[PDB]
Amino acid sequence: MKILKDDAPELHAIAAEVPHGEDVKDLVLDMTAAMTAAGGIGLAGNQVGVLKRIIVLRCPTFKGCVINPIITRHTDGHVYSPEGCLSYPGKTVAKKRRNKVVVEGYDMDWQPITIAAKGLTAFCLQHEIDHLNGVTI
Template identity: 45%
Template sequence: MRNGSIPGTHGRVRPLTLLGGPALHEPCADVSDFGPELASLVEDLFATMYAHEGVGLAANQVGVPLRVFVYDCPDDEEVRHLGHVVNPRLVEADGLVLRGPEGCLSLPGLEAGTERYDHAVVEGSTLTGEPVTIHGTGFFARCLQHEMDHLEGRIYADHLTGWRRRKLSRQVARTSWHRAR
């Protein structure tokens, strides 16, 4: 997902996996090693997300097939949510189903009206193994569901049907990044 501000970070910016990359279409594995490599991955995810002006980024979007994502995302009341989650599980997605514009760093420059629940709860752990529960509403709930989809090997385009799906497919075919593959 995309955002506008770029706070500082200590990680390195990694190349993004774009639509069509196999890493985006395979479920990710659970993290079992909570050591310094995981901490570096989380720092790199933040650096990459900020460099590309995102609001969330999953590890498989940088070619690492592990269940980790980071976020720096506002909710509909402009409250900022900042953090990461390791081995997350979507335990609730409910409330109203809303269609809203959704983009993805792995489909740069594109977006489509995508249906998501306006409430979501994710449980997992921090990079040190401490349990964490993340509650999201509005746009932040959309972000949580979007990143969870990535970890399951799905992208927002997989939720589209009919003319929305056909329109996005035509837009993808016209992008320079897709033609360069």
């Protein structure tokens, strides 16, 4: 796998929902390995040229993948979140984020999962889900 250059069109494209039960274990393994090899804590399909709704995270309160992630709950208003991104080396942006979120989706074995997160972990979930919608910092 390769983390695509900052001018890759995939970064603006929409990731396709994964058909329920599709075997994506190798994809998840590859994305996880690319994320850690590059020293990151989050990665989305688009960033490695995989236009599928898959994110991987290595965050303080969640480590693993989410397939077909959706945000189902969040706190009102916003807080400041300084963020970088493996697709944009050297760039940090002060983003407005929800302080707390609930994310729902599937793990690699297609077990339904629910992730309640605050602070850094919540910011990462928002950032990575944004990627699947072609939204970048």
